[PDB]
Amino acid sequence: SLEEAVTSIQQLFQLSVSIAFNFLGTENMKSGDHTAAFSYFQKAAARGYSKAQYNAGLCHEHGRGTPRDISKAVLYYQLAASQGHSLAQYRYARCLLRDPASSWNPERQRAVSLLKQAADSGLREAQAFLGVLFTKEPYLDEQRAVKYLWLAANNGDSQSRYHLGICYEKGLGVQRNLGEALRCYQQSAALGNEAAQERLRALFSMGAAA
Amino acid sequence: SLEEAVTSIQQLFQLSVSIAFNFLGTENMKSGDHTAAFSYFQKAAARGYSKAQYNAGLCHEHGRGTPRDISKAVLYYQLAASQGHSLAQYRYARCLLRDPASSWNPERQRAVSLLKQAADSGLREAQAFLGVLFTKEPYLDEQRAVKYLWLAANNGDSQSRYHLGICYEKGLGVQRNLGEALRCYQQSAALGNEAAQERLRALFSMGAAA
Amino acid sequence: SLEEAVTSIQQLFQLSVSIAFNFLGTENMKSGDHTAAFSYFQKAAARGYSKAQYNAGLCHEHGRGTPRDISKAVLYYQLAASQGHSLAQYRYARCLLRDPASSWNPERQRAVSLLKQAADSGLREAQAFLGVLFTKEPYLDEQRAVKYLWLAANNGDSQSRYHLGICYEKGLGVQRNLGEALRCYQQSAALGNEAAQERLRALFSMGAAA
Amino acid sequence: SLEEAVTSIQQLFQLSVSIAFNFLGTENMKSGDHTAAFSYFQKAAARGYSKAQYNAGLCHEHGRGTPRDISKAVLYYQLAASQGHSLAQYRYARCLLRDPASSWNPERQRAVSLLKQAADSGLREAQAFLGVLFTKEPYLDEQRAVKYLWLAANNGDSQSRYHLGICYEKGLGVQRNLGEALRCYQQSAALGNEAAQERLRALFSMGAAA
Amino acid sequence: SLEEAVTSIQQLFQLSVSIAFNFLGTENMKSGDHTAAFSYFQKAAARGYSKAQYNAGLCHEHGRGTPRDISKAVLYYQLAASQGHSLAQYRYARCLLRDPASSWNPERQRAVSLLKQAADSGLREAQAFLGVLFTKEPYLDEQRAVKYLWLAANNGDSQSRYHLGICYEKGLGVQRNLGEALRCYQQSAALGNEAAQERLRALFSMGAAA
Amino acid sequence: SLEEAVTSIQQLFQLSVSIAFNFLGTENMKSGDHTAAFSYFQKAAARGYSKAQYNAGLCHEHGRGTPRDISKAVLYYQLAASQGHSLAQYRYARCLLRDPASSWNPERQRAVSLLKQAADSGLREAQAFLGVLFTKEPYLDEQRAVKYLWLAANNGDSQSRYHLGICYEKGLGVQRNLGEALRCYQQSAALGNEAAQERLRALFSMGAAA
Amino acid sequence: SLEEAVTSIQQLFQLSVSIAFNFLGTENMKSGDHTAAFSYFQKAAARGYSKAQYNAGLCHEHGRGTPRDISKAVLYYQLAASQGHSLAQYRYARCLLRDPASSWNPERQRAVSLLKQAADSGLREAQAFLGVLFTKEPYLDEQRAVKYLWLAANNGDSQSRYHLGICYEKGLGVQRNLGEALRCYQQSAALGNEAAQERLRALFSMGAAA
Amino acid sequence: SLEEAVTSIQQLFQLSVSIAFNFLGTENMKSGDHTAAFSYFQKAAARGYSKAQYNAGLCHEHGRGTPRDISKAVLYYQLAASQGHSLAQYRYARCLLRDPASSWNPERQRAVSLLKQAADSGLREAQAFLGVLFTKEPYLDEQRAVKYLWLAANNGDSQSRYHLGICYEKGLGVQRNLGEALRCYQQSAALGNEAAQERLRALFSMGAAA
């Protein structure tokens, strides 16, 4: 019975050293050391760990100690997302979908599906971005966009709720109502959505005053 | 007892002939004969009757059977208003004050005071007219304007309550509120105020169109 | 001064005998005598009296003691409506618009215009009639129909308010609101709309509880 | 002295090796290796651990690397539930109650009791499932079913609140209300109940459309 | 010509003497003389007049100067009701239906029908009495009773709306709702329905703070 | 039949001459002649007419053409109120209850009873006056005062509704509620009440910085 | 140098053996072994650990494997509460306040103070218990009792909100409101207050049923 | 591989001994030993650890075992804040900015910026304190103050709710609403904001009802 024991202990040692390298790295990043943080996260992600791959991608696309790169960054994000990390797949989808390119390529469908199943978890940013993405060409699906924008806005995001308000006012996906749109704009401006909410409130409060 | 009896009976004869002539006149006007109605109303008003003076002024200012005249119309309206006919004094004030002339003369102040007294009697039009009046130079009194505009709007006038809404959104006399103004615009659209809705709803919907 | 006096007294005699004929006819109708009511109303309406012509038309189109007739009834209703009687012109439009024939004749436009400027006075039935009429071909004007149906239903008519409810539910002229339509149906059935509100409640109950 | 120390250290060693094997197994399952995860979970559950027994039951009922089995799955689920694991006992009850068999067998009595005391903890799924279960024969207990459906739907489940709405509409256990039921259907369709709420909305649409 | 004119003038004289006799009767009743009121009203009702018959019935059933008599009052109310007097027919129905007898006698059929078509006119008391009567054996029609109780209570009658509240809380005709019944009792106490509303509030306080 | 006929015709002559005297009095008062109006009103009121006695009391207590007198005024008001005139008895209460004397004299009880049966008719001012009166010593009856203040304020009187607000905030007769009291103050001051505005702005607006 | 190191390592060893014994003990209790759990918890609490002392108190007051004792239970609870354990101090206060003895003994003063500062943390049970406690003699402090009952019931406790409802009806510490109290009773019965809310609903049912 | 391994293991040892020293420090603080807690926290913070520095600052500024000092306290707070400790950076900002001096010194700008980015994290006290901060000279920026007071009051802080109410009633930053301000006062007094809310309720009670 010692063979399974030794296999178990060596696999546990592998996993534990991965954990320790990741924890070290994040402690260095929080403390202030960065190049050592990059080295630690790279050598931790080289051996198949989820959070390590996420942080490697995060530091390698923010470039907090390495020139700004996206290719290897999104490769790390893919490798982390395949293992079931919510933030990793959110970042992967947001980085791959930043272009206005068409959705004919299958990797776009894969990215939007993984972002969808990420937003199913409950992360605030993923579902808000999904609601934004499904509202614009060529991902037009008004009902799902509305429902996820509303669900994200219920968590307290000002911009998502302003987008819900413009969705009501423009009358796409939801019946064209104006009073709820006005109160939504007012509360979004109250919650400190400076640019868009302030601009729309000022326009509506000046069109009849100028 | 014969002297008081004969005085009473002759005064009754005067009042009865006044009533009969006014009646006849209004029956002729309703039936379709007009010049006879004019003559009847003039000879009824020449002998001191309130409603007869109102009808004479009305038929002189609309001119529905006599060339348009404002001088005699306004004089007859003055005679009718001095005796306590609410609609007559409303018409007097509206016809005399329709000019954009200054209110330095006290006679205009007398006209606006009698308009106030007429509106205090419950007439729908006088209240709305003074609500419009007090918002324009030099009759600036915002609180009274708002209160009587609201009182007239409670009777169901679309224009008066649209002016209440414009007052809310512009924030004069009342704290500057937008949601109540929007619902007021919407309900004024519901009652069919063409000039109000067909401009305000279009201006608040032009923002939706891109 | 005798010529104007004699003309005035003979006009007064004419109008007063018309009044007497009308009053005696309506008293006979209320008491129970009917053929005398026809005779009196006809001889009163033959000499140019508004309410007398209304009653003549009413007794000719209900036929409460004379065979049912339309041509004489509609002619009397036209003659009475020309003189400014709200009920007269309401009944004229009711009896003229009841046919399913084409509206190429301008008399139909005249009838709808007089119905409109009748219902603008405040009569309950004319408003509901025009609200129904403008909803059907070829008088399609959704906004006016909705507004007058609403201000008619505000007076407490169950059928007009049920028609407002179906207007909301079907989403013609107003945005397709559904909860308001359900509440309107329910409180129409509360006021005793025996047929319509009850049958929609039953249809949405039996076909909803399965 | 030393005897209690050695007993404590050996018991701690047994517990720690159980913990390590469970952690290993779940790390392998998350990473992607499966058969090793099955072996690890099996040998961890063979020595009396709660979460390990739950994971063994889960991997035997989904069969993500082992032929589908319910017998061993439910045995492991029972062994995990007896030790106080909320999600495991929820799974046990939902697996044992999937059959349409009667509740004469007292194993069903313990199953429903353990599901009840699991839902008392606050898990979303168990409460909704029991709310569904108590509605159908022979578990009829309307008040408790409605209360647990309501408090489960308060957590944001679309199907639970849709079933609350159908409970309102059919009026079983709750006073028959219809407007709030319609609002509940509408919001559940808004929250993304793609099948059921949308189907009832369409039914209430085509009910009057055709 | 002569014959129709003389018939018209003699019928007018009959009507005018009836009017005068009724006017003297009501003037005497208001002034304070009562036996002359009985004489005038009796001789006025003896010649076929509506409100004269109503007043004769009123003075016979109150006996404001004549021994209490119901048979003559009931006959006079019948004569007044047959001629189309809303208040008189309401009085007839309420006087005839005071007995707890069944509705097998068709006299009760006419009584209830005329009370129905009187309450349809807009009188306050008739509606409330019908709402009460349809609630009690053998006139049980819950929906009609509820709808007239509500319509009468809308006019501001305190006792009718207290009956509406008792009907709602007892759950006949309308489903059992409690909060609305609670502030229905509260407003009925506020509007001065001292007896019933005070009793219900006192009971609801004694059984609560016991 | 000559005796009853002559009695009827002479009584009709008495009533008709009273009506004529009152009509000439009111026509002269409206026209502008005052002493003749006084003479006619006294000679009409001396011979048993209700409205004439009201007008005589009114012209004696305002003194619009005769030196101020209260004795004759209140005597005429008593005679007019004994016959069932709402305004007459309300003015009797006006002129009698103004004294700060005690209510030991039963004539005060008669005055308040006639005021009660006046307010039961539906006049606006009498109810507001009794609502003020029952609040102050020794007429303390809080419930009735509140109920009739509320019912009168429902008619739109600003002072009565401000008194309703003071009653709410002070917590006499009603539960001491502040939010409804603040609102009530707000719309009372909105309708142009000097006292309500001067109380609100000095209590809940000045106390902030004073 | 080495001296501080050896002191630190020996103190860490004491703390770690305490932690391990506590963890062991709770693992044995959850697994099913009890007397070993008692021994482990006893020897862990004998050396000054907070959670171990709480568990010792719990196992001495429930007696799930040791004869029931309150003396040692409350002594352990005090020793755990002095170190800052919220649930332990809640248990101490609830065990010491179960007697109906007076608060003359200052041990009750510390007990109530520690319960207060425990409830200040946010535990549901302690706040509800103090809300119950301050209502009854001699701990009468109505405002604080109501506020803590309200904020505890906001967490979803049925009995706490039922006691809030009673507080509303009896009107102690809060302005006596009845409609909101009825709604609170109804919702608490809906949330599953099987005994008390249902009993009051039945009482308010049979109060009018019989 | 020896050099990277030895560097990793030595860095891990340094971090682990820092963790252990902090753990024994907090264990001593909770147990009751204080001077040892001070020594351990100081030697842990001397080697660069975040929450150890926070605890050192806390023990120097409360002085729970050392004479009161702010200098070393704020230096340790700066060291902890620079490393990303939300609560520590709150404490640093609040301790540095307690002085009433101006914001000319850049250290105040740094403190307010770090407090801003602390409040943006989600800490309850930071947002409330910053809402208070921006209200007073020279940090006047009303919108941010209003939004942070609103968000903090949404978390249940009574004083923040009172300051929101004072902001509404005083009409700075938000429109001068008074009704919802009174409701805010009342329901903040319900939560137990004894001093200020009780003071305002007493001022609005004595000045109004006395």
Curated annotation (Swiss-Prot), chains A, B, C, D, E, F, G, H:
A motif (SIFI-degron) lies at residues 79-98. It is found in: Cytoplasm, Cytosol. Disulfide bonds: none annotated. Changing L15E: Impaired oligomerization. Ubiquitinated and degraded by the SIFI complex once the mitochondrial stress has been resolved, thereby providing stress response silencing. Within the SIFI complex, UBR4 initiates ubiquitin chain that are further elongated or branched by KCMF1. It comes from the Eukaryota. Changing R176S: Impaired oligomerization. Changing L12E: Impaired oligomerization. TPR repeats lie at residues 18-50, 51-85, 86-123, 124-157, 158-195. Homooctamer; oligomerization is required to activate EIF2AK1/HRI. Interacts (via TPR repeats) with EIF2AK1/HRI; activating the protein kinase activity of EIF2AK1/HRI, thereby promoting the integrated stress response (ISR). Protein kinase activator generated by protein cleavage in response to mitochondrial stress, which accumulates in the cytosol and specifically binds to and activates the protein kinase activity of EIF2AK1/HRI. It thereby activates the integrated stress response (ISR): EIF2AK1/HRI activation promotes eIF-2-alpha (EIF2S1) phosphorylation, leading to a decrease in global protein synthesis and the induction of selected genes, including the transcription factor ATF4, the master transcriptional regulator of the ISR. This is DAP3-binding cell death enhancer 1 short form. It comes from Homo sapiens. The lineage of its organism: Eukaryota, Metazoa, Chordata, Craniata, Vertebrata. The chain holds residues 228 to 437 of 515 of the full protein.
